[PDB]
């Protein structure tokens, strides 16, 4: 990835082997958790499309998920070309390159072309666009890897409220929906699926009670 | 924005002059990158020390066979051959730099510099650049060629590289 | 490997022991799977032919694969020498003699000569050529390690669709026959070998079905 | 080692604690496997005889192997001193004297003399000769650690061809025979010592047998 | 169909009856087989869209195949209209307006307009475009009339190798999924489905075996 | 095929449908026999490569033989390329370029280029070369279609000499060998494989007896 170099002139610095090893280890140890998306977004800050292609090729296993990621990248490139076609217009006095769906995906774009598109003024946000595409793909993958539906989350007879709410919020974060749907679900589904012993306790507190009040109520 | 490369030409080792070329990378980018990179020699192989093996007075000067030195060879920076990128630009006059080939989608490294308008070549050879400085050096070169192309003296690319 | 300085020039640098340790560990732990070529290309960016001969000779075990790689490098060097004959006689003062295939391999040349080739004007990419040759050899090696053929894939009555598609895409990435042939295979062989119940669930969606709906159909 | 400063004079630098720790660790962890010689040649690059003597002395245990290595160094120094006369008397300034065998061994010299002999014009590869001697000694050591001979390898009835050829190439790498004799061995004994089934398979395969087609034929 | 004259120009010519008779006879007598497409391409060289609509409407029987061809032509015409949009503004004096997707078929245009389109300056090849569309439709028709798939081929214990390879290549030319996939199939599926005795006779020659020796092995 | 047109100017005349129907009929009844090569050479006199491709595509069935023919055409094209190299470069305005190895087979050569190569002065014998290639392929195919070898031809006890000599000479003509070998083959095999009584009858005539005397010997 390119980085601000002293002084004020961005030059290309190849991806460090330690970053690739950290990525391989986090994909090996954590599989495909919701948190990987932030770890991926933070490990590849300002990365050229070639670096993101390297980081997606260095993965070991989960080839089905990588295939969905590649297909969604292709779909985003296709839609991007459809949303950004060259309509006839007077030619600009200044010419700057332009990134195609295939030029953004780093397939047919040489490293020099990407460095140009990034360091030129005004900059072309090819890296951020490809990162948005990969993040959409990773969201698809992590929502697919969900073992059970959020509607099936129910507490055991003696399962403490601690592990119950932990697992429930984990599955809810892995689940995909708008924020208002989650706001309705945390009020309609959480208290209902609790164990009756502590369900009575949560009902005694009130419907609009916060999480900490219920948690300290059923505490112990 | 569009790269510019030069060639210092030599006739049997006597220095003759510099021809410099503007490569139209904004319309034929992959063709222009291949001539640019072969001129710098940055990929390990290239034009420096190759010769114009076929010069036909009033038509064109052809060169670029750095592997076999007689029109049967040469290779691109993408492999030995690649597609005809497009045919936007036409052979409009002297100084146009166009790709030689052995039929369609057979571009390698051979190129020819036109010294006349050759509209019959349109649609059959990709045009990707034009002489910027040095056309009288290309014209003087004609005198060392013949109707069938055979040249009388060795005409070499003594040095070449990128200027801008 | 060469590294740029503050003013922009580059000079030889001793190979880091961490790189060698990581390479040997990943070769031992991950054996010869499709995800060794990206990590190999990432570990030895800008490495001299001596460094690549080091990284290859240092691989203990799997000597048959290393012999295959050596034979492939030998054939590539012979073809390079045949396609680019070297000139004889005195060499110009401002130019260093061009390397032969056995010298592109780095077998009969000193490190200083490699550094002079890599930092010449114009630079000669011997390291990139030998890296391409090693990558081709590693592709042939991972082709050889492929356990099963692509056609013999048939899902068991109990083997879940996730494991089936995982194995399929694993051996498909290990096949690497071509790209369009791979695209035709993932359309035909993927749906041709499903378990009858989930098979007809996938046929209910027609050939226009994508992989995501293909999986969530048999899911749950 | 002697790191070459960017666009400047080459500056001497003490051996890194990281380098020495990696060296002692690989010695302790892998004993004396055939790859310790490549890894040693990798870690010690451009190092003075003082650095090489330190890297040898930090080794703990295997004192028989260490004494054999020192005896090999002594024999090489004796041969060098016998086939190279040593001049004496007043020496012109700016020109170092004739390096003796005990000095190229580093047992009777100092870091100043070593750096002087490595900076002279033309340079005298004292480090590259002492490293060659150490590699000869390490080769003798790894030959001594060879558990079984090469002519006595026989494939087990159930032991697969992959494991058989792995052991065969490991013993071949350990073997001491010249490279010209080394080729005939891997051409003949490999197919002459296998199990009868794949032996007849490779016999039907006939001449020009290469490892890749051999392993693809002995499959199953 | 147009025909050149002594002066070199071409003009419309009435379609010959024993062409229509030959086409109807070959369509009925041979029904649908891979060798109807070359005959169709040879019979109607230079034919106007009216002549092709004649040769298609004249085919009595197999009306389902003709409806498939009509549907394929229909979809192809729509794609042509979508890909190129007519330009607006003033038209050049030396040029006049082009046909539409439906008029390429000749459904809503007179014969004189077809002749003017075919002999214009520069000429417009409407006949060749509609012939390509009809050839694609006939390819789909001969695909449908295939009596089996490529994978189900398994030679019987008594069925000779000649009949097996004939059936194989017949349904392979009738498959037309691709060309490189065909090249992979003729290597794998051809050798994978032989009778055990002749199967191992073919395996005696290895994968390098060509078809001639492949058959003369099982011959006699 | 092109034909001499009044007066003295060859113009292109497309292949007639009656010729194609005759070819389809002779490849429907005669199928593959020794007489097909002579019939093919007479039906396609002076045919452009496109006409020969049309005549080879119209054959229905016998796909293995057509594939053998295509592969032998490719082999002959490769040999022609290896023997007649084609130099790259701009063509002269008056004369046409030298046809490559694939320009003969009509694969990438337009009809106009072939017409030029044939009508130019001096003419390029592309048609005769492609006919020689197709004739080599047809010879291969008809020597393959032989049911039994010439060594297996033996007369029955009461099978008349007429049928025996007819079948023997038919198999000998279908067989492929030099005429010089056939001169010994006939004098060694014709009399030996006959019936014992007719064997003695022919041996009474002499070893060098002609065919007509040998026939009239056992006549009736």
Short mmCIF file of N, CA and C in Angstrom, two decimals, chain E residues 1-3 11-15 40 43-56 103-106 109-119 124-131 134:
data_model
loop_
_atom_site.label_atom_id
_atom_site.label_comp_id
_atom_site.label_asym_id
_atom_site.label_seq_id
_atom_site.Cartn_x
_atom_site.Cartn_y
_atom_site.Cartn_z
N UNK E 1 -31.03 -14.96 -54.50
CA UNK E 1 -29.67 -14.61 -54.06
C UNK E 1 -28.93 -13.77 -55.09
N UNK E 2 -28.12 -12.82 -54.62
CA UNK E 2 -27.38 -11.96 -55.53
C UNK E 2 -26.29 -12.77 -56.23
N UNK E 3 -25.93 -12.35 -57.44
CA UNK E 3 -24.92 -13.02 -58.24
C UNK E 3 -24.13 -11.98 -59.02
N UNK E 11 -26.88 -8.14 -58.64
CA UNK E 11 -28.28 -7.75 -58.65
C UNK E 11 -29.09 -8.96 -58.19
N UNK E 12 -30.30 -8.72 -57.70
CA UNK E 12 -31.14 -9.79 -57.20
C UNK E 12 -31.42 -10.82 -58.29
N UNK E 13 -31.59 -12.07 -57.86
CA UNK E 13 -31.92 -13.18 -58.74
C UNK E 13 -32.95 -14.05 -58.03
N UNK E 14 -33.94 -14.52 -58.78
CA UNK E 14 -34.97 -15.37 -58.21
C UNK E 14 -34.37 -16.66 -57.67
N UNK E 15 -34.89 -17.12 -56.54
CA UNK E 15 -34.38 -18.33 -55.91
C UNK E 15 -34.69 -19.54 -56.79
N UNK E 40 -26.98 -26.31 -44.99
CA UNK E 40 -27.74 -25.07 -45.02
C UNK E 40 -26.84 -23.88 -45.35
N UNK E 43 -26.10 -24.07 -49.10
CA UNK E 43 -27.21 -23.91 -50.03
C UNK E 43 -27.59 -22.45 -50.24
N UNK E 44 -27.51 -21.63 -49.19
CA UNK E 44 -28.04 -20.28 -49.21
C UNK E 44 -26.94 -19.23 -49.08
N UNK E 45 -25.85 -19.42 -49.80
CA UNK E 45 -24.78 -18.42 -49.80
C UNK E 45 -25.22 -17.17 -50.56
N UNK E 46 -25.23 -16.04 -49.85
CA UNK E 46 -25.67 -14.80 -50.44
C UNK E 46 -27.16 -14.61 -50.53
N UNK E 47 -27.94 -15.43 -49.82
CA UNK E 47 -29.39 -15.33 -49.89
C UNK E 47 -29.90 -14.16 -49.06
N UNK E 48 -30.92 -13.48 -49.58
CA UNK E 48 -31.54 -12.38 -48.88
C UNK E 48 -32.37 -12.89 -47.71
N UNK E 49 -32.69 -12.03 -46.74
CA UNK E 49 -33.55 -12.46 -45.63
C UNK E 49 -34.88 -13.04 -46.08
N UNK E 50 -35.43 -12.56 -47.20
CA UNK E 50 -36.64 -13.17 -47.74
C UNK E 50 -36.39 -14.62 -48.15
N UNK E 51 -35.24 -14.90 -48.76
CA UNK E 51 -34.92 -16.26 -49.15
C UNK E 51 -34.74 -17.17 -47.94
N UNK E 52 -34.16 -16.65 -46.86
CA UNK E 52 -34.01 -17.47 -45.66
C UNK E 52 -35.35 -17.71 -44.98
N UNK E 53 -36.22 -16.69 -44.94
CA UNK E 53 -37.57 -16.91 -44.43
C UNK E 53 -38.33 -17.92 -45.29
N UNK E 54 -38.06 -17.93 -46.60
CA UNK E 54 -38.63 -18.95 -47.46
C UNK E 54 -38.13 -20.34 -47.09
N UNK E 55 -36.81 -20.50 -47.01
CA UNK E 55 -36.22 -21.79 -46.69
C UNK E 55 -36.62 -22.29 -45.31
N UNK E 56 -36.99 -21.39 -44.40
CA UNK E 56 -37.45 -21.81 -43.08
C UNK E 56 -38.94 -22.13 -43.06
N UNK E 103 -36.16 -5.78 -38.74
CA UNK E 103 -35.98 -5.70 -40.19
C UNK E 103 -34.76 -6.47 -40.68
N UNK E 104 -33.80 -6.78 -39.80
CA UNK E 104 -32.73 -7.69 -40.18
C UNK E 104 -33.29 -9.04 -40.56
N UNK E 105 -34.34 -9.48 -39.86
CA UNK E 105 -34.98 -10.75 -40.21
C UNK E 105 -35.72 -10.66 -41.54
N UNK E 106 -36.04 -9.45 -41.99
CA UNK E 106 -36.83 -9.28 -43.19
C UNK E 106 -38.31 -9.46 -43.00
N UNK E 109 -39.99 -5.66 -44.17
CA UNK E 109 -39.29 -4.89 -45.18
C UNK E 109 -39.40 -5.61 -46.52
N UNK E 110 -39.49 -4.83 -47.59
CA UNK E 110 -39.63 -5.40 -48.92
C UNK E 110 -38.28 -5.87 -49.45
N UNK E 111 -38.32 -6.63 -50.55
CA UNK E 111 -37.11 -7.21 -51.12
C UNK E 111 -36.17 -6.13 -51.66
N UNK E 112 -36.72 -5.06 -52.24
CA UNK E 112 -35.88 -4.01 -52.80
C UNK E 112 -35.03 -3.35 -51.72
N UNK E 113 -35.59 -3.19 -50.52
CA UNK E 113 -34.80 -2.64 -49.42
C UNK E 113 -33.67 -3.58 -49.01
N UNK E 114 -33.92 -4.89 -49.01
CA UNK E 114 -32.85 -5.84 -48.73
C UNK E 114 -31.75 -5.74 -49.77
N UNK E 115 -32.12 -5.63 -51.05
CA UNK E 115 -31.12 -5.54 -52.11
C UNK E 115 -30.32 -4.25 -51.98
N UNK E 116 -31.00 -3.15 -51.64
CA UNK E 116 -30.29 -1.90 -51.44
C UNK E 116 -29.36 -1.95 -50.25
N UNK E 117 -29.76 -2.65 -49.19
CA UNK E 117 -28.90 -2.80 -48.02
C UNK E 117 -27.68 -3.66 -48.34
N UNK E 118 -27.86 -4.69 -49.16
CA UNK E 118 -26.77 -5.62 -49.46
C UNK E 118 -25.79 -5.08 -50.50
N UNK E 119 -26.26 -4.21 -51.41
CA UNK E 119 -25.41 -3.64 -52.45
C UNK E 119 -25.16 -2.16 -52.24
N UNK E 124 -23.96 -3.51 -46.49
CA UNK E 124 -24.41 -3.92 -45.16
C UNK E 124 -24.79 -5.39 -45.23
N UNK E 125 -24.12 -6.27 -44.48
CA UNK E 125 -24.37 -7.72 -44.59
C UNK E 125 -25.53 -8.18 -43.70
N UNK E 126 -26.75 -7.84 -44.10
CA UNK E 126 -27.93 -8.32 -43.38
C UNK E 126 -28.10 -9.82 -43.58
N UNK E 127 -27.81 -10.30 -44.79
CA UNK E 127 -27.94 -11.72 -45.07
C UNK E 127 -27.02 -12.56 -44.21
N UNK E 128 -25.77 -12.13 -44.06
CA UNK E 128 -24.82 -12.87 -43.23
C UNK E 128 -25.21 -12.85 -41.75
N UNK E 129 -25.73 -11.72 -41.25
CA UNK E 129 -26.17 -11.65 -39.86
C UNK E 129 -27.34 -12.60 -39.62
N UNK E 130 -28.33 -12.57 -40.51
CA UNK E 130 -29.48 -13.46 -40.33
C UNK E 130 -29.09 -14.92 -40.52
N UNK E 131 -28.10 -15.19 -41.38
CA UNK E 131 -27.59 -16.55 -41.52
C UNK E 131 -26.88 -17.00 -40.26
N UNK E 134 -29.60 -17.88 -37.82
CA UNK E 134 -30.24 -19.15 -38.17
C UNK E 134 -29.32 -20.32 -37.85
#
